[model samples]
Target: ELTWHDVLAEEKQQPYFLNTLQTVASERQSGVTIYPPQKDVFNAFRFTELGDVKVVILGQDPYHGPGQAHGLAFSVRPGIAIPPSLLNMYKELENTIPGFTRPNHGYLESWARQGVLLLNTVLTVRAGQAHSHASLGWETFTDKVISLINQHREGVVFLLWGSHAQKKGAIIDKQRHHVLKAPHPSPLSAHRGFFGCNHFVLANQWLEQRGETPIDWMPVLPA
Candidate 1:
């Protein structure tokens, strides 16, 4: 019965974070269609243990499409069409990893299990409305997550794409962690830099140099 709040324990203690949850709860009561479903809202914490995180990937918000956001950011559930940004994500990943194939599936929980905190700054959003939950107070909790990792972990790789995700990682102590920035893999901007940014490979090498295991970017296809 260890809920996400019980597991993190620290954020659960923050009064502001409690208020954040209260507002989300209120919204749900008001019939707001919260993306990622109620149970999956915290799947990031559920997938990557507090002490097991080795890399962090910052995202803006959950997908607004119905059934698209299943907790992790930049990921959609099976049977959902590949999003434009995620399509570029796979392109760059395939470019970096020799044996990696662009997946038919968009579920990236495999990366989460491998220690990639596929964290969206705004953990929940209103269905069909992008950025609808941006100011609903999820920021304080997600920022705290980044701060906790920065304060406690060393040699963690942070892949920050786009200005927004990059802005959130500004608090990271670069001396203690490796931070990589590129234009967002959003199809609109991927051409500028994200297309050629070998972040997956570079992060793996960085982890290996620090004696940490590299992530298997090749996710096993789900049956």
Candidate 2:
């Protein structure tokens, strides 16, 4: 029911995107269960359109667990428990931004609605198998997304957390946009650098400087 418009909507008619969908279809035929289901695959676009996007946070892939991975990267369904990576994200924000609290849930629609594009490098993954869909052509499509934003959008803030996302975001033109890199939020590496990155604060600072509205990183969740 959600739509894509501007430079990205036209992507649906392109060969690269078509081929990417083709592979996902093929995977389903082989009886592979993909997390995030089908309808929610474009939830990211549904929440933040290309025209509305002011910030971009790149993620590796969807959470591979059942009931998690609701299209937006690092986000899960309302009733699902917050994944470790997102928990770390909340912890970092609480430390960086005053009066921020960790929500009981990790659904990120609140941020997406405010133009933070929580896009994953790979949109879907096999059940309980992380990064399983990396070879399925999602990267080419998402790369087109990153480059389109880089070329068409100006003064956007790109948070390239983790080395994988950093490399993927390398094509962003630094002269036109702002890029901030840090270690991944996964427990395996959060200690190294992700904890004190102040990405939320920095993103808001830059956005306000560019005359855009600053993002309220805290998601208002219900108990």
Candidate 3:
């Protein structure tokens, strides 16, 4: 089983990161909330390695609903019913990519494997409650992640959906990277601006221009 320490092993050497993670783990151990199981908490970094990040997709927090939120932001476990925001994302992908077939499952591991960092600002949450862990120190850790990507990773594409994600990347230098801004893909607001944003296609275009391989945004089909 992968533990948080294992997921963050490389970064734990940094004092600031070490202290922050230790604080978060100790607090969660003492808290009353049913936090995400240890394995799923660091799923974002599982497929997308720390040094190889190419594109970033930010979410506010993990899903609080049951049987959902297996680490990658906006993704759910296979066989679990897809969430509304993810459904909207799939719909948009179908529209954006010609001949795209929607997957029954919501898992986005393929994207992560292809260098899309599905990062959530707050990594864990109490079951049955949204934003339960927002006040915890996860934000500070994720802010460091965004900072690292902004400062070190060149030609990266940041898909800042929703106001929260957009605000988080407000300091990203557009001159050095590609920042695609749009409304949240949740069913509640996807119609406002997310539908025709063409972010998936545009992201690939940018990647191709940068001499990097374009991501295959289509979901992996089970054999």
Candidate 4:
């Protein structure tokens, strides 16, 4: 039952975000049911507020399956089976940080709390259909977000995995930010380069060099 107004009321400086959300709201009023439900659609922005983003992990879209997507791209609710891409991400995390135990769940809300922007190029999907909402203007909203980050957020670490995610990196200012590009950790692509990308270690190193706290890449057990 969450509306655009509820999610975007505090984004006063990002008028484009407001406009994009309003357009999306109008489109959703046609009684179409989008996955992740309306309440979870903007979950990425829930924990890390504007001006607080330290890292950006971009994904294509929310998972189309029931009980999988919880707004953050590549993440699922607790108890949902881990997606192939996330499993590979954990594999890399373990390799990057020796002896890291892979968690049984895939929820990434803790990363968001630590200022990682786990965002999707497209936020919503029709149940059982990938990219069903792509043409609905989410791309424009996300593009603006990238542009803002490129222009305003200096020294942020951007993890652009996969070809789709890599394409967006063209807009980022390489001089102002640290971008780590690699093949996505999906089963079909991980072997290409994602396994040894070592993005987790590099991101933390970059943050520490900049006097920020290194991100905790392990899954956080909920209280």
Residue 119's lDDT within candidate 3 is: 94
Question: CA shift at 42, candidate 4, in angstroms?
Answer: 1.0
Q: Give the worst 10-residue stretch by lDDT in candidate 2.
A: 1-10
Candidate 2, residues 75-134, lDDT tens digits: the string is: 888999888888999999999999998888887888998999999888888898787888
Question: How many steric clashes does model 2 contain?
Answer: 0
Q: Arrange candidates by TM-score, highest first: which order?
A: 1, 2, 4, 3
Candidate 3 clashing pairs, residues 3+ apart or interchain: none
Flag regions of model 2 displaced more than 4 Å. 1-4
Off by over 4 Å in 4: 1-31
TM-score of 4: 0.88
Could you tell me the TM-score of candidate 2?
A: 0.93
State each model's C-alpha RMSD to the native: 2.4, 2.4, 3.8, 4.3
TM-score per candidate, chains pooled: 0.93, 0.93, 0.88, 0.88
- Name the lDDT value of residue 196 in candidate 2: 94
